[PDB]
Symmetry: D5
Subunit: 131 residues, 10 copies
Amino acid sequence: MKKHGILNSHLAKILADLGHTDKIVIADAGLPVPDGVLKIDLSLKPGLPAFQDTAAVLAEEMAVEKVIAAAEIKASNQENAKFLENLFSEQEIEYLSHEEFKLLTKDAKAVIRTGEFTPYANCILQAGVLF
Amino acid sequence: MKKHGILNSHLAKILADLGHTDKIVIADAGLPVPDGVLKIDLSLKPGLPAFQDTAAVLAEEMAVEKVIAAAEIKASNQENAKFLENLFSEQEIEYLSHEEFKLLTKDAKAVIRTGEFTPYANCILQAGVLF
Amino acid sequence: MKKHGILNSHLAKILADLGHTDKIVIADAGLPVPDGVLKIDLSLKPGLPAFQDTAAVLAEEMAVEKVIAAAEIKASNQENAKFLENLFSEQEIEYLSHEEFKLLTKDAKAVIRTGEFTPYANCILQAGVLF
Amino acid sequence: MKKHGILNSHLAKILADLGHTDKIVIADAGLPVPDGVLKIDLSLKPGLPAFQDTAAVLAEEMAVEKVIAAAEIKASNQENAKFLENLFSEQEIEYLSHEEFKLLTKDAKAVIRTGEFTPYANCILQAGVLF
Amino acid sequence: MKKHGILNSHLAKILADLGHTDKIVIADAGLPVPDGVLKIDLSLKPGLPAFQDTAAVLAEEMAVEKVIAAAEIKASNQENAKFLENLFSEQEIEYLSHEEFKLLTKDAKAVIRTGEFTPYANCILQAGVLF
Amino acid sequence: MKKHGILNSHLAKILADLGHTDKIVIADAGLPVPDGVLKIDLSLKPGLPAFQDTAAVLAEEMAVEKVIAAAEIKASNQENAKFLENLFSEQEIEYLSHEEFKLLTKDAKAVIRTGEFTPYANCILQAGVLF
Amino acid sequence: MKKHGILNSHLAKILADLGHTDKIVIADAGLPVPDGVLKIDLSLKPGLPAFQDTAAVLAEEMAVEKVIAAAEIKASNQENAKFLENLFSEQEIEYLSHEEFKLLTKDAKAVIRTGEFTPYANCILQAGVLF
Amino acid sequence: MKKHGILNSHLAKILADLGHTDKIVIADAGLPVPDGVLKIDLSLKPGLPAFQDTAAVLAEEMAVEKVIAAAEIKASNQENAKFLENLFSEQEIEYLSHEEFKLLTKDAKAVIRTGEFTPYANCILQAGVLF
Amino acid sequence: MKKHGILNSHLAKILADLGHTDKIVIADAGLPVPDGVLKIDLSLKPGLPAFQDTAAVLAEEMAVEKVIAAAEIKASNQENAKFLENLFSEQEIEYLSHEEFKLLTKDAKAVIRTGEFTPYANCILQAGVLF
Amino acid sequence: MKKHGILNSHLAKILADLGHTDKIVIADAGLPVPDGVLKIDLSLKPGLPAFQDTAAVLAEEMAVEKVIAAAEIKASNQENAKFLENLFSEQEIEYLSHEEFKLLTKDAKAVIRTGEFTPYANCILQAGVLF
Ligand SMILES: [Cl-]
Ligand SMILES: [Cl-]
Ligand SMILES: [Cl-]
Ligand SMILES: [Cl-]
């Protein structure tokens, strides 16, 4: 067995290829996945896994230099919006319209679908560099 | 969005094709997956999701006429062994040696990998019929 | 066997991947399917299955936020036009020219071909969200 | 549009390649499909389409020299058993154990899944020759 | 064996998918086939099968609402030009320059190659509808 | 255009790879094609192309060192049986049971389907060598 | 074995599909092949096979309507330039800049690589017709 | 970028899928790779990377339960043989004939090729479990 | 075994297809790889193999006519920048901004990832010709 | 361009993957190629390239430890048989019956077809090692 790194085999393969500026998306149960973008669905039932838990695991296994979310999150989902600010304190958090957000996901290397059933619980993590 | 059935998109596709006697495997984080068998990895981190959580969701979305597990589960993993007995109290449960169990996984339509970090936490659910 | 959801295995896989705003098409026996769009043919013979029967099953298994149809349906197929208006009384129904309608089908995730032998008996169902 | 022959596009492609002695299967909603055999699912909901309707259409579009069915059908589904005997009065009808029947399906060119929710409502149609 | 419809297995598969306005091309032995367009070659030797033989079989198995040919056919291949006029006397026949004709073949579902060794012996059959 | 050789593009590709002892099959409209064996269908309608015409074209484009046919051809189809004896005078003509014949076709590089509607009009041409 | 036509199996397949105006390229050992264009490498060692030997064989097996080469060939490779002029006496020979020549290779059906180790020994053969 | 685990993207993907008892091979530059087994070539030039450097990295990123090498390594490559014995002090080390060793490589998930230019510098690492 | 040329099997395949002006990229551990471009990862651990070691092997096995690197390498990675100048003293070295450099990698035949952990340690080698 | 090694890009890729004992076949224009074995056709016309020229290039670019040929070559093709003996005087040359020889080609990594038009002009080169 693999001693270190993220436990999920699908995610490990994606993290392995990340280069500077590559993007991955963490999504709620409703976000549409653009054609041609790999979809890794971890959901089991509503609320499992949760957006926060998934985002937390990724934060410690991936070097993030920038986080992108939809402005709508601050109003429609304040609890998860704070979680992000708190989790990625040192990182730059950029907000956009949910529409612009969806356009950006077309460039993602993958969309990770969680079991999150709350509005606008989605974010794009932009890979940083280790040196 | 799909209104009914299992939430996971990969899993729904597998359940959709199940016919009478088809088998799927729920596995712990260490079970090897035979070549040619589709692997759906739901693991996030050790213990998440758990064998019990996964097995419960599947029992709720699939008609199971028989369950198969390794005999070593009773002696080395009593908690989960009893969980299976209780969950599938109405189905026929059969115990084979772990070696025979693995040979049987070769005929499975898929192996669902959980984040379970306890010994012999694996089972084969054999589909029943709705009429 | 799968306990809940749509019975058709091909359709179940399509519904499983639906995200907010994704579109699917229910079509009569004559509608052309754009290159690159998945085609699921349920027809058996003229009139089986009917547009009405197919649309009814989908409405029950999928969350629809909007329905799109060709204005021409109100002129050459009033029967199905009324059925559509009745079935989706709660949803927003928009009529476009048949030409525009066909253009929009290029973005559908799939076209479901029925055995319906009446003119303009086609519609686009746009997926809603469960939360 | 195609003027003659079976309306279903998937089925037309299968019938087109049929040579003397090739086999196709008409099945109820529960029959398992062997790995490697093409599966065409026409089901819409329980009972639609019915075994009888599907078998009738195929008999009209394909030259059948022999029909194979499981002996169990005469016991648990007399209605469909009679229909079969009547529909193919001119053809040779052989009954085998359901176990043997399933084995023979491994050599079929395709399995056509209907919405039939009654036991052992399955049959193998062996193609004849037109000259 | 298939009882009704066109005898050629490759062709039956193509006709099976035709929807209103879809196009197929019948070509002489020299027409170039655009990249991405399926080529079905029925030629055996020069003149076998002939353009006329092929076009007649297709007219009998497909509903054609419009025919398209190169204007150069009238001047350089009168026999076949008149044949088309007579065969499709009830359909709308449109003449474009051979250069425009070739550009149009890019949107065809397939090109059927005949053994015809006479100039501009090509045409596009545009599928009509059965209701 | 290709100046020399067989006109059919599909057949030319097959002949190009022939080595000493490779086999190709010429078949009537009813012969079943084994799984995994390439099928090139030249049929247009019943009787076109004919078995004799196809066999004749192949004879002049391919070096044949042996012909294999089903014994049944001599009784059930004497006219085509004579054609073969006459066409491949210098070649060795071996006869087998139609059943053994069908088994042998599994090794063929391709099956060429003609529009021949007469019994046992099938043969296997075994490639010879040019030096 | 195949009796007539080019001996090389790869090339035979390419020639077989040629339609009027299709292009193939004969290249020296250094010409870059555009992505998407099939490459058939015949080189064994420097000078084997020569551009002249390869061009001569293709001229005998393919109907050439027009030849295209880079102007630079007249300056740095007069020997092969004269050869080309003489081999294709009856055909039109167009000279373009090497840069434009390379752009046109992107439309070629194939690039045939030779062992030629002399500058600008490349040419495009545009297929003609046999009627 | 990925924070933890092996740095090589290809290897990370291989380790990610490892289950208990799965095997990977570390090989010298001459070991043949069985058909069907994925090959990951890390060699740059003779001696880079060394068998020792590669084996050391894998030992730190993978849970090794058992090591298998060819007996011949003790005779012709004592240096690397001692290395292996010391690196895997706690693991079981089985020596088989080189011929048997090669047969076992057919079951490996991958063969990692190094730049090692010394005889029998090959070994099979059998995955253990983390619980 | 292959007697001459680069030792790495993956790289040998890429060098084998190089034509005049084709490009390959040598990258540090963080450079992102554009979609569609082949990635050959030779890294083992940080600093192994080094940028200099990789570039040196390539310069000896590939005819280079031009080198391209980011301007930023001169100030942020002086050591490697000097190496680059010395190694390719004969060839033309062009410096672009890193952003412009990355756009150019879109056209590369491959990206060779090294274990280099220093910024802007990337370069494009543009193939020359041997005559 | 690649500076060293065999010039042919197809062959370079095959030599790159050779491991100890791997085999490649050099064949005359008539040797049949087993299904599943890669065929690289270098022939241009009868006698070009010749068996001797091809074998000579390979012997210089590949480390050979053993040569295998049909016994029949000694009596039916004396010239090439002598060449074989002289070229591989150091290596072991084993002679089997042609039928046995052909069975061995099943395991070859590739068959290189030459333009040789003389009987039994085939041989298997079994790869050796460089250390
Ligand atoms: Cl479902
Ligand atoms: Cl049909
Ligand atoms: Cl040919
Ligand atoms: Cl990892």
